[model samples]
Target: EYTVEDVLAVIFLLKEPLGRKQISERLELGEGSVRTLLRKLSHLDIIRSKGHFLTLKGKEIRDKLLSMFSEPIGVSVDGYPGIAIVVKNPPEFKSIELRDEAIKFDAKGAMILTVKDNEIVFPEDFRPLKEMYPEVAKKIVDYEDGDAVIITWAETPAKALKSAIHVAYILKKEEITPEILEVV
Candidate 1:
């Protein structure tokens, strides 16, 4: 069975190359488990690493997976340009915490949340968080509309691709389609 952890590991790797130690520590999993999963991903040719940063394959499967989403919403992370899997008029604010918001959208796997230009930081692995980018963080906190954006993590390359489809579905209350109402 494909555990959520397996999916999470993939999501983390997609954002950036992480060593066994980094992935394990970030996901709070056993190093051995991460190694095993990385091996499996390697066999699929989804990722390649040689003791340093892993090289992502720039074609075929990667393209197919990414193409599942209509288009990503423009955003900035930690002050750098990036795209996000976002949903406006997100589900009710269960709590004033980003972690709670992320939990509601479980299909997103792991994510960050910003409400009206404020970033809510919760201490937990896989916890929804505030944007790493101050500008984006501010946008989320300041936007007047009763909307919130969940910036799903693109950590695991393959898993991120899969989860992107799921986020798109949640955003539109349907599967992948360009008609997602809040395409910002």
Candidate 2:
């Protein structure tokens, strides 16, 4: 069960698909032995061989491993200051955890409503009107007021919260007055 051939088969499956001959050479096993083990594994449904390509149960393990290495986030507008989840320099690392990379915002859930560089856009859904002040979420591409803003928002709670917080912090810093309108 734990033979070198079996080990080589799994490793080969992970590294790249290998034929029985290749597996034999890599594991230094006799071709007959390698073939026997390979057949057994195939019957076990652990490895499926089709032409040069070999798909193994190991692929599932590899996929899970990949998911662990990559961080994903979601942003939503249903939080404090229409927050967003970010994967780069993230603040709340909960299920809505932020990562270090880019901002992810919900493009479908909540509407962008409006985007203003020099001012803040407050919709009726934008509760706590004071928090929507222009000073917050100044839409700056650069760090300065009325500058170009580099914002990427998503429809996930995490990303939304992060974006909202960052925007709120900026607006507060700029002392911009928020112009709130009744949700029409």
Candidate 3:
């Protein structure tokens, strides 16, 4: 009966943004327990870190998660590429609203954005939790102070990073680690 918190903790450790001090504060856990958890997780290949930074792979087990939730897509006021239209949170279950004013591909109708090898596709400035919707933000696996592109449909489920992280968290909660999660 792993909780969402546990899964999120795993994701956080995987990304390895928060230092031990930050981990204690963010997760509100004891230093000793956090260290043990990190060690065990790292040993299991669930997360890997070198004190300053950490990295983990959820590619094998990101899916098979129950959709937690998503907020209403906010209309972009800053005159970005997208218009005031539908942006599905936890996009796995909902339809990706590519509006008429939204980006349209050439003759092939290909997607302007996509994920390759677990890479998120957004410009540097506009990446990370604060830049993203608050509810959806926690789900992204943290990766230092810098931000990556907030591209949906890039990861396995092809949702926003937060949603993907949430998916990873949820799956991890269900004990679906990389070793067990598979395409079959």
Candidate 4:
């Protein structure tokens, strides 16, 4: 079964009316799963698809998600592809769990970073990110107090981006207007 992450991802990508195969590939989802997702969205009146178009309700939901999460930002880590995501007020969470969630999405490694006084620091320990990877702290942008910055890296750019998005989705959990899965 698809999670709110899949539902939200579909809505966001539908803005482009991309081919189904391309959409499925982008989300690392099977085409059959993607087809069902589209059906669910249509049932909710959130979208209409030949290629897929977001309705007014869909637009609002996607925009709301955007406000809570930033699009993946690409950065170079040891010459390997890396992607980072900044999530607004990410729920009370253990950094280890967040990192685990990233790895579940095929990330070779990940960082669960938090902002204390508007500066990046490790979640378990309040150590400043600059103490070890100074450049990494600089790599993350658009962060604020209480925001969570997720950095993930893998063999390829897309995998890294997918991992970051997964971590962000996990961090978001629940609690929002129209709650991503009302009609699911």
Candidate 5:
């Protein structure tokens, strides 16, 4: 049966070029299943076989699909404000961790960072989020030349971009594209 894994498989593939075996490992799927999924996608012309990368058509489709999940969340790093976090990848979902020391902002009380309308929402007092969530900071700090992290804050623009992209990356892997619309 066509499943969410099938959709995620394409997303992960788009994130980076990977062999079937690597995709299988990342998605925790059987080799045969991955091969089938890849074969199907190739037949559809959404992806090409040369190193298994998305074609222009594939990218077009991916961008359109991702648009549905590209909901923007406003955030602030430290005391700075006026930053928006947009979710590009909409399948990897995970929880964020926080320590007392992580909460640098004066805001108090526990607020859950959650998803609404397929977009992840971050609290206004995001100091704790920046400090506590290592993955977010790391993703932004360690972003490569062509990485997808893009945004701006009063300070630590890369850090803010990375954190926003990180949250989206985590959440994208956790959910499936609701429906696979035909690539235009």
Candidate 6:
């Protein structure tokens, strides 16, 4: 069965969809088929069709999404195939969980960091990440204090994006509206 992770994936990529076949194909959603989630997304009045064109209700949740987190962007890490996201003012979380959670979603690996005093720090330690990996600072832009950065890598860009979104939900759960995720 698809969970909030799947729902978030649908909404995150829905930006006025192109096709359901493409959704299933493009999302690479191995957990379950995209049909179940899309059916429910429309049932909740989030999208105008079962797949394409989001309704205004859907737009509200999408805006809320951007308010708390930056859209996943591709980052050149370890050869290529990874995505990064910035979470704003997230509550204290387990770095192990963040890394492991991404792996659970088929991510090969993940790097979790926190922004402090305009510098990126390992959440597990106060040590700066840019000190060792200088280019990482440039990969993630406009970071501020209290923001958590997650970068997940996989065999493909789709998997990496899904993995990042999967772990991000753990931090966003308390803040995200249930209506956007739960069945209507």
Q: Evaluated with lDDT, which candidate comes out highest?
A: 6
Q: How would you encode candidate 5's per-residue C-alpha lDDT over 36-89 as one tens digit per residue?
A: 777877877767876588877677766764553443334544455322434443
Q: How does each model score on lDDT?
A: 0.43, 0.34, 0.33, 0.77, 0.43, 0.80
Please report the TM-score between candidate 3 and the true structure.
0.33
Model 6 agreement with the true structure over 1-184: per-residue lDDT tens digits: 6667667777778876657777776577642567777778778888867448678998898889989988777876767688889998888888887898899899999988898888889876679877866665578875689899988889988788888988888888788888875752
Q: Which stretches of candidate 4 lie over 4 Å from their true place?
A: 14-17, 124-139, 156-158, 176-179
Highest-scoring model, TM-score: 6
lDDT pick, better of 4 and 6: 6
Per-residue lDDT over 1-184 for candidate 3, one digit per residue giving the tens place of the 0 to 100 score: 3234344444534343456676655444567766776665566555555552433344233222222212212222222211111112212321133211111211111111222244333332323223433433334342222212222332111122223333333223345444423211
**How well does candidate 6 match the true structure in TM-score terms?**
0.86
Using lDDT, rank the candidates from best to worst. 6, 4, 5, 1, 2, 3
Model 6 stretches with alpha carbons more than 4 Å out: 30-32, 131-136
lDDT of 3: 0.33
Off by over 4 Å in 1: 1-5, 52-148, 151-184
Steric clash pairs (candidate 6): none
lDDT per residue (tens digit) for residues 1-184 in model 1: 3333343335434555566776665444566667776676666555677632434442343343344322344454443333354444455543234433333434233443433433344323323353344554444332323344445444333333344434444444432222112111
How many clashing pairs does model 6 include? 0
In model 4, state the lDDT of residue 15.
Answer: 63
Error of 1 at 147 (Å): 8.9
Q: What global local distance difference test value does model 5 have?
A: 0.43
Q: Which window of ten consecutive residues has the lowest lDDT sum in model 3?
A: 101-110
For residues 16-112, what per-residue lDDT tens digits would candidate 4 score against the true structure?
6767787788777777788888788788888886777888888888788778877666776666788878899788888888788888888988988
C-alpha TM-scores of all predictions: 0.39, 0.29, 0.33, 0.78, 0.45, 0.86
Give the distance in Å from residue 32's predicted Cα in candidate 3 to where it truly belongs: 2.0
lDDT string, candidate 2, 74-167, tens digits = 2223332232211122122212122222243222222222223433233234332226434334322222122222223444433343343333
